[PDB]
Amino acid sequence: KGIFVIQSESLKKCIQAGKSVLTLENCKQANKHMLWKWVSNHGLFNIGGSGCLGLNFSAPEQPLSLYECDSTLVSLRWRCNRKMITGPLQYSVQVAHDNTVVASRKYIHKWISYGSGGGDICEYLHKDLHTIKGNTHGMPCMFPFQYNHQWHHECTREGREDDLLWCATTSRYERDEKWGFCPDPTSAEVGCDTIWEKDLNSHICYQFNLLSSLSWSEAHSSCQMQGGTLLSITDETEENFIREHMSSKTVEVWMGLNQLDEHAGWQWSDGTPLNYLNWSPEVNFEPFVEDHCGTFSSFMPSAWRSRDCESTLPYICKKYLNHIDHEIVEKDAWKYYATHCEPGWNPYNRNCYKLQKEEKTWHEALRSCQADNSALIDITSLAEVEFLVTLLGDENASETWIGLSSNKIPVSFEWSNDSSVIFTNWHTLEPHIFPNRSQLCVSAEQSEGHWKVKNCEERLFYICKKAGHVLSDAESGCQEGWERHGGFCYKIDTVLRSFDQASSGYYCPPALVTITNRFEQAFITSLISSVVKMKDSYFWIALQDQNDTGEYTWKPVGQKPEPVQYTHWNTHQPRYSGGCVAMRGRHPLGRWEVKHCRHFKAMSLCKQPVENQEKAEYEERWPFHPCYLDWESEPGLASCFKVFHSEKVLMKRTWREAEAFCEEFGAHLASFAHIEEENFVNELLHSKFNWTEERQFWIGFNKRNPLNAGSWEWSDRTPVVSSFLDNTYFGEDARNCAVYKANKTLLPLHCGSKREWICKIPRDVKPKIPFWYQYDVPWLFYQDAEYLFHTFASEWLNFEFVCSWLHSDLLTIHSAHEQEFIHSKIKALSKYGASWWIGLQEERANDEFRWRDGTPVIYQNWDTGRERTVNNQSQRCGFISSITGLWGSEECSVSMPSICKRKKVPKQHGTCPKGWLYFNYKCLLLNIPKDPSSWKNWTHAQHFCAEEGGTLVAIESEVEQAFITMNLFGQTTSVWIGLQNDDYETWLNGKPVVYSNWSPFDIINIPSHNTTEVQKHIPLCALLSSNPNFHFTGKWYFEDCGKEGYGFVCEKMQDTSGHGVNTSDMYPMPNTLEYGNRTYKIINANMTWYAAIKTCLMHKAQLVSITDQYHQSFLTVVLNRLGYAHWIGLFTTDNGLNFDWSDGTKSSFTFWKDEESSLLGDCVFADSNGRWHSTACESFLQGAICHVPPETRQSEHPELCSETSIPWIKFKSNCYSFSTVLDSMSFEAAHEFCKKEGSNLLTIKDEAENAFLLEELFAFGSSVQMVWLNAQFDGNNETIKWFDGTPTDQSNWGIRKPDTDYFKPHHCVALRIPEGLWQLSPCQEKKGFICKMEA
Ligand SMILES: *[C@@H]1O[C@H](CO)[C@@H](O[C@@H]2O[C@H](CO)[C@@H](O[C@@H]3O[C@H](CO)[C@@H](O)[C@H](O[C@H]4O[C@H](CO)[C@@H](O)[C@H](O)[C@@H]4O)[C@@H]3O)[C@H](O)[C@H]2NC(C)=O)[C@H](O)[C@H]1NC(C)=O
Ligand SMILES: *[C@@H]1O[C@H](CO[C@@H]2O[C@H](CO)[C@@H](O)[C@H](O[C@@H]3O[C@H](CO[C@H]4O[C@H](CO)[C@@H](O)[C@H](O)[C@@H]4O)[C@@H](O)[C@H](O)[C@@H]3O)[C@H]2NC(C)=O)[C@@H](O)[C@H](O)[C@H]1NC(C)=O
Ligand SMILES: *[C@@H]1O[C@H](CO)[C@@H](O[C@@H]2O[C@H](CO)[C@@H](O[C@@H]3O[C@H](CO)[C@@H](O)[C@H](O)[C@@H]3O)[C@H](O)[C@H]2NC(C)=O)[C@H](O)[C@H]1NC(C)=O
Ligand SMILES: *[C@@H]1O[C@H](CO)[C@@H](O[C@@H]2O[C@H](CO)[C@@H](O[C@@H]3O[C@H](CO)[C@@H](O)[C@H](O)[C@@H]3O)[C@H](O)[C@H]2NC(C)=O)[C@H](O)[C@H]1NC(C)=O
Ligand SMILES: *[C@@H]1O[C@H](CO)[C@@H](O)[C@H](O)[C@H]1NC(C)=O
Ligand SMILES: *[C@@H]1O[C@H](CO)[C@@H](O)[C@H](O)[C@H]1NC(C)=O
Ligand SMILES: *[C@@H]1O[C@H](CO)[C@@H](O)[C@H](O)[C@H]1NC(C)=O
Ligand SMILES: *[C@@H]1O[C@H](CO)[C@@H](O)[C@H](O)[C@H]1NC(C)=O
Ligand SMILES: *[C@@H]1O[C@H](CO)[C@@H](O)[C@H](O)[C@H]1NC(C)=O
Ligand SMILES: *[C@@H]1O[C@H](CO)[C@@H](O)[C@H](O)[C@H]1NC(C)=O
Ligand SMILES: *[C@@H]1O[C@H](CO)[C@@H](O)[C@H](O)[C@H]1NC(C)=O
Ligand SMILES: *[C@@H]1O[C@H](CO)[C@@H](O)[C@H](O)[C@H]1NC(C)=O
Ligand SMILES: *[C@@H]1O[C@H](CO)[C@@H](O)[C@H](O)[C@H]1NC(C)=O
């Protein structure tokens, strides 16, 4: 129970709010009245007050009061620096002269907790519980939430007949029904789905969290919170069990398998070893890419795949029920037993070992070990790995064969002895299965004991293990020490308590402990776990920062310059400089923490030294010249740095992209092992740049690995010395990477951002690119772009990056003429005459026609010899033949050569003829005929424009496109445009196509023809889509120039022979505007986002909500007229994940300026060109856009919408079920299922419901492709009708659809969910279905 009472540090009073504004009162029994808690949004929810502390930024001077956290009127966010309560814009709660808080920037003030006296108020900072299932796709609980006329701050019971705890995903349960069950480990009886009692005694339970699209990090978290763990596929038997026992056969789920540690190989998130593997080539293998997490599907093949962990997918949790003592798998694995052996052999704990240094094949080495009563080594515990690395400490001992190998095509790894596997230490990339060899054998490397597979025929050294028996009960190492380990002994005690302070000597004569390796850390963890006398204790460690510097370091024994090479910090633990390190005893055993040396209590640790004196440590000649002259560093520093201020010319880079760039030079994203390094890099930055903070640079500091304790780490393996924690502003889990700034400071960030960076390299530069082909760039002679022919063999999943580093990401073709030039050059006689890569990319088995450049593939030059080039999506990368130049697709890793390119070698207002619309120094006609007889084909409409004095529109810019779209609202007739398939890049008027709005699909998909075969004989003509679906609305495609059925837009510059009548539209600023079927108010005052919300509410309107591209287009013209930004009603309670509209309308429409712009803040505004931007809500902008809403009223029992049995989502007056979406099933079967359920198969009756569904189903992503629509296709008619007889008005097809495709047994129509189009399909296919009913 995290509730607390908050007291002023400087004044013995606390916040017992009371009515209206809160007040400072004595902590009398009113502590039993007013208490405080942290909730979903950072705000503080005052229990009893049933409120939520807010700050009115329009007038901060007013005393603070309690609001409803659903309120958008006031800023409710709060932040916690050291014992502060800090609001946005530097404000903070702070008592005025009077005893009432006036949160102000005036002066600092500090707060602490009553009761326990917690020195930090934020000891109970909120953590988000992800709901498992029941009405929502696994969102976090939103606290507090309004149940029946009352607020709740914790998961509750009342709502569900069943007694499991539940919560709401949205602030008000009554208004929105998105509830969900709450994680709980206690309710195992109903907490988990299926008990697989088949195991001997485990009674292992499984929870099949389908429907719960989550990132891997959140899935792992969720599974943990109930006491379970992400799925571990121990063996084929359990894999096949789950294969059948899961229900929705078409889903892909998270497992638990991962390679999140870039320095370690694939591993189960749980403690299970990775011995059984079912990798499938369905995913393409590359070592560098971000596919770090493992996905499993119950398809016919036994296949696992690699995905990006942030992707949202369902998952499965795994929990053993009998293992209460599971904290450590083995209890006595670390205790040393006095061992003896014969000459040549080295004794280790209770065993004999010997390394032969005789290169042998695996079979040869096994037979050699068998020559004696010995077998190749088997590793049972990390202690054996420690001994392995110690022995490989032999003079060369680079690698050794391990007594472990595979003997199956579906690989399962077993020892050379018929015994089970208990541990695995796979190297960074070496669980890699050589395609089909029957047996692959593992060798261990000397660096860390990392294992890697390879052909068993390889000749390598080998170590034979042998039995032994205890020599005696003596401990010759340190009889006085409590235990021995390796080359030291340990004498922990739970009596002496101060931080090593002793009258003489120390608590033990060798003083406090120092940790150099994870092996040592594990041993001491075992020690503490063995001697936990009283729970959650702490133990002192020699690491301290008493000479307050931030760079915590060991307390040095005599003249010892003891460095630090390993650390075990707790969650976001290395907070503040100064103090001493204490290691935790609570069940997260062994984690380190910082503590106060005069106030904290911890117990004594000891390290009896090596019985043989150690020699001198280092030579230290290396800083003579740490790196080549190319890189920068102090002479004397241990590493070198290089700052990358641009890409190609001035372009930035994502975090992982910059890291890969450092890697291809051999370096890492920079890291600070020392305050000296940090200061040196700051000084370098300020030597390079001005008195500016305009530049933010990437660094290695990151948090991308969540399976370990959530805490930051350097990508370079250097340990994190304390207090480099960028800021106390932690908890922003959405941000996972970090950036550096001048004045010695760091900022958390989202790794998806783009920035400049800096790489660090200790000793040796390894250029992989050498900046190839430094003068083969100039090719303007042929086109307007400069090309480059990369003759060096390279696969372009990576070479796209290097290609971008000077040019486009890859070459892309948009002209038969440029293709002729490319063929002429590529017709090279030498090895350069091989096939060549191009930017042509495939994203699915379908969707094989997108450039990685991002442009749609509008021009075709395929070779027709291989139209079946899919190879289960492996062949996804395009290439051109050297002999003909015809294209082809290939598996991307083949790494043939490639190419690159890059795109750089009187406006007076006037009169507008009648009927035309004057928009921007020009007039548009926008002829949309109402008569079929009046329709013109493109080659005719050109005549009309010419005779009228203009030409077909040339859409020069997004504002022109938006104007045309807004002047095309209700006319569902597409309209010609003035560009031709002959040249996608030049408008008919003769100027380049800089702007473009090509449709995502069907650009050349003429229904009456093949895509390509007859197209090459037919001219094609541009055409502006009038489709009412925002994915297509105002988009461009092509159609037969001779076709008819489409209007035309003529353009002609304004007639300047007279008044500049554009003033008639420029001058007026109508306070109210009408468009489509709604009315807008343009406010033009100085205000924040909250102020704009309040202003719209003080008006009768509400802050605008933009649900479609038509309204977005109108607002684009409006804002272009106004000339400056305005607020809009889009905001997010959570940082940059998913925004919501202030007025509560749901729509998937989004019009961001750029992908990263979504992340720059919490409240959204619109640019002068309409494009959206996120930003801090406290910013001040000179206007806003309100819209008048349609008024409606509600019933008394709409909460009837959902029962306790089924996940029913309420929308307006009807409920939809989405659980059935994944239940792939046939048409009539779905019909009958809904019928018997007491509902009807989905019916799209209005645009509001259409948009609501298109948004809601986006939560499942690619988990479903199509859904059945309850519409009958008439037999001898083209008509389509809902089961209720209502017309099919809402129907939509990207291009006008002929009925000629349905079979006599009528085809049945479904909804292509990712894009929203309709499509008739064979009626017996298996698809998802959605029931719907009234509330
Ligand atoms: C829209 O209205 C808001 C209303 O708040 C307005 O924001 C306010 O702007 C003023 C002016 O920038 C801020 O006042 C400043 O606050 C700082 C706080 O440290 C003071 O230091 C400033 O005084 C110093 O600087 C002055 C010259 O800049 C000197 O003359 C003076 O002697 C001091 O040296 C100054 O008072 C005010 O803080 C904000 N409001 C909030 C809540 O922060 C905003 O600017 C308006 N928008 C537009 C476009 O005008
Ligand atoms: C887009 O639509 C275009 C409109 O149709 C044309 O309209 C013109 C109006 O003046 C007509 O002149 C033109 O036909 C002319 O035909 C004469 C020869 O006359 C014979 O053929 C016509 C049909 O072409 C027939 O109606 C007569 O009775 C007679 O048998 C010819 O010498 C001229 O050059 C014109 O072609 C209409 N038809 C055509 C085909 O031009 C049309 O022009 C255009 O082709 C359409 N777009 C595409 C891609 O076909
Ligand atoms: C946050 O602070 C702002 C600014 O101090 C508050 O705005 C003010 O709210 C009052 C109402 O409490 C407004 O008074 C009303 O003005 C209208 C104007 O037409 C008048 O018709 C009413 O009879 C009444 O007098 C006041 O104008 C308004 N001032 C501004 C600059 O907007 C706001 O109420 C505060 N909100 C919260 C939740 O504390
Ligand atoms: C932190 O950043 C600043 C700016 O990027 C670094 O330079 C400092 O910049 C400020 C102006 O922003 C300078 O102040 C000016 O000083 C002159 C002195 O003649 C004065 O006439 C001006 O009116 C103004 O006050 C400041 O001097 C300057 N200091 C230095 C050392 O360059 C600053 O160095 C950065 N600090 C760190 C630790 O990186
Ligand atoms: C190990 O072998 C290398 C050559 O393979 C040799 O240079 C080196 O001196 C040997 N000893 C050690 C300790 O590396
Ligand atoms: C391991 O090898 C020994 C002989 O070295 C053998 O007796 C034993 O059975 C093997 N392990 C198992 C589980 O059988
Ligand atoms: C498959 O395994 C055999 C083992 O003899 C090996 O020669 C071959 O290179 C492997 N790969 C393929 C594609 O056959
Ligand atoms: C700081 O370091 C000096 C040695 O240079 C030492 O004598 C002194 O006690 C240290 N002070 C603290 C607070 O650690
Ligand atoms: C910094 O900018 C000022 C602008 O006045 C200029 O005088 C100075 O030379 C610049 N210095 C550097 C290092 O860019
Ligand atoms: C994969 O190949 C098989 C033939 O072995 C084919 O039946 C299947 O359709 C392919 N997969 C896809 C997604 O096309
Ligand atoms: C083109 O469409 C026709 C339709 O009859 C079909 O016969 C032919 O095989 C198709 N060719 C290609 C290359 O798609
Ligand atoms: C505008 O919306 C109202 C809503 O009741 C509807 O009755 C009216 O027909 C609509 N007008 C147009 C032109 O769509
Ligand atoms: C075709 O449509 C008409 C209504 O326009 C309807 O009466 C008739 O039954 C339909 N015929 C078939 C075969 O569906």
Residue numbers in the entry: 38 to 942, 952 to 1381
Authors' text:
Most instances of MN are associated with the presence of circulating autoantibodies against a podocyte cell surface receptor, phospholipase A2 receptor (PLA2R). PLA2R is a member of the mannose receptor family, a five-protein subgroup of the C-type lectin superfamily comprising the mannose receptor, Endo180, DEC-205, PLA2R. and FcRY. All family members contain a homologous CysR domain, fibronectin type II (FnII) domain, multiple sequential CTLDs, and a short intracellular C-terminal tail.
We expressed and purified the soluble ECD of PLA2R (residues 21–1397, spanning the N-terminal CysR to the C-terminal CTLD8 region) and performed small-angle X-ray scattering (SAXS) and cryoEM structural analysis. For single-particle cryoEM data collection, PLA2R was buffer exchanged to pH 6.2, consistent with the more compact conformation. The structure of the PLA2R ECD was determined to a resolution of 3.4 Å. The PLA2R ECD domains pack tightly together, presenting a globular structure with dimensions of ∼80 × 80 × 100 Å. Each of the tightly packed PLA2R ECDs could be built from the N-terminal CysR to CTLD8 using mostly contiguous density. It was also possible to build the initial few sugar moieties of the N-linked glycans into the cryoEM density, highlighting the dense glycosylation of PLA2R. The domain arrangements, and therefore the interdomain interactions, are different from those previously reported. The key hydrophobic residues V and I within the VIQSES sequence are located within an accessible cleft on the CysR domain, while the SVLTLENC sequence is entirely surface exposed. Of the two constituents that comprise the epitope, VIQSES occupies a surface-accessible cleft, and SVLTLENC is entirely surface exposed on the CysR domain unaffected by compaction of the structure at lower pH.
